[PDB]
Amino acid sequence: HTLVWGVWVNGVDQGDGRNIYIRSPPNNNPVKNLTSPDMTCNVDNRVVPKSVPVNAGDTLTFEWYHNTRDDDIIASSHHGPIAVYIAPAASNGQGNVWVKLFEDAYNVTNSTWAVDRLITAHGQHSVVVPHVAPGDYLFRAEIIALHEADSLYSQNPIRGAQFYISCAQITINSSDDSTPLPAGVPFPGAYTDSTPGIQFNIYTTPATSYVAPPPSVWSGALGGSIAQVGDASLE
Numbered sequence: 001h002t003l004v005w006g007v008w009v010n011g012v013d014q015g016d017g018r019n020i021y022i023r024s025p026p027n028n029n030p031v032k033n034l035t036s037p038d039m040t041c042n043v044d045n046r047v048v049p050k051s052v053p054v055n056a057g058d059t060l061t062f063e064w065y066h067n068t069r070d071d072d073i074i075a076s077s078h079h080g081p082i083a084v085y086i087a088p089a090a091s092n093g094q095g096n097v098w099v100k101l102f103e104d105a106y107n108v109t110n111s112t113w114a115v116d117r118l119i120t121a122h123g124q125h126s127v128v129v130p131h132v133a134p135g136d137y138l139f140r141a142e143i144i145a146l147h148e149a150d151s152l153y154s155q156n157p158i159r160g161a162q163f164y165i166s167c168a169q170i171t172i173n174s175s176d177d178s179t180p181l182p183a184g185v186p187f188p189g190a191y192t193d194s195t196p197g198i199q200f201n202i203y204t205t206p207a208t209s210y211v212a213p214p215p216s217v218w219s220g221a222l223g224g225s226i227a228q229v230g231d232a233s234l235e
């Protein structure tokens with residue numbers, strides 16, 4: 001159970017985004033139904049009044065929280081991967097439009113899942129804004145908690161992988177457009193019951209055998225990290 005409070009750009013807090021530049025749902029409940037329209041941007045997908053201005057090459061940091069800002073972030077039981085997608089805003093997230101900019105699942109060196117490191121990062125994870133056309137975009141951050149992912153929701157709706165999905169409205173002002181955005185995947189649609197990484201047993205299968213769901217990260221993506229960029233207790 002987790003939500004996005006807001007974003008930072010190049011280490012500068014853009015302020016509370018909830019229902020303002022984030023298409024915030026009403027609470028921190030997970031999405032579990034892989035075929036629902038809630039998979040696109042969570043249960044309250046509507047245009048909110050502001051979009052955060054960035055330029056290509058900027059560092060865009062999402063900041064998650066559990067109940068209040070900069071708390072325990074998300075229960076430590078909720079091991080799993082983190083991904084970030086982008087789509088043009090004119091799509092409203094419909095169609096084959098979501099392009100993956102970032103994926104982190106299990107780090108063999110530190111023996112930690114993305115979620116574990118997200119907690120340590122005080123909720124913060126970043127992507128570098130790609131050199132796409134200037135314009136309005138949706139950035140879709142997705143945490144997949146795997147503590148009940150040994151079962152399929154479609155078979156047992158008490159269990160299943162849990163998706164914590166947040167869409168931010170971002171405007172890219174300056175960019176050379178050196179890597180035009182390609183077409184992507186649909187949400188819902190990309191993930192199905194037989195997609196790798198959706199059904200998995202984290203208690204008995206080594207985390208080193210986990211494969212995150214496709215699609216793979218786009219070759220135009222400029223990377224990102226799970227790491228604190230700013231101190232919420234100061235600003």
Ligand SMILES: O[C@@H]1[C@@H](O)[C@H](O[C@@H]2CO[C@@H](O[C@@H]3CO[C@@H](O)[C@H](O)[C@H]3O)[C@H](O)[C@H]2O)OC[C@H]1O
Nearest residue numbers: 075076077078147148149150159201202203204
């Ligand atoms: O010993 C192992 C068991 O622990 C494992 O059981 C899972 C433990 O986590 C359960 O999910 C909880 C649901 O309620 C949330 O508030 C908690 O944060 C979650 O941890 C899950 O339902 C159990 O299957 O099974 C394998 C054993 O080896």
Ligand SMILES: O[C@@H]1[C@@H](O)[C@H](O[C@@H]2CO[C@H](O)[C@H](O)[C@H]2O)OC[C@H]1O
Nearest residue numbers: 012013014015020021050051052053
């Ligand atoms: O100079 C920046 C401001 O531009 C920034 O304003 C953010 C931008 O993104 C969204 O529109 C949000 O609603 C605004 O508050 O705030 C931080 C400041 O340093």
Ligand SMILES: *[C@@H]1O[C@H](CO)[C@@H](O)[C@H](O)[C@H]1NC(C)=O
Nearest residue numbers: 033034035036037153154157
């Ligand atoms: C999943 O959502 C789809 C599309 O809205 C819906 O038809 C189906 O009833 C849902 N399944 C469950 C178990 O709620």
Ligand SMILES: O[C@@H]1[C@@H](O)[C@H](O)OC[C@H]1O
Nearest residue numbers: 001002027028029066067
């Ligand atoms: O539903 C509960 C939610 O209110 C809380 O914020 O996180 C734990 C959940 O079980």
Ligand SMILES: [Cu+2]
Nearest residue numbers: 001002075078
């Ligand atoms: Cu939860």
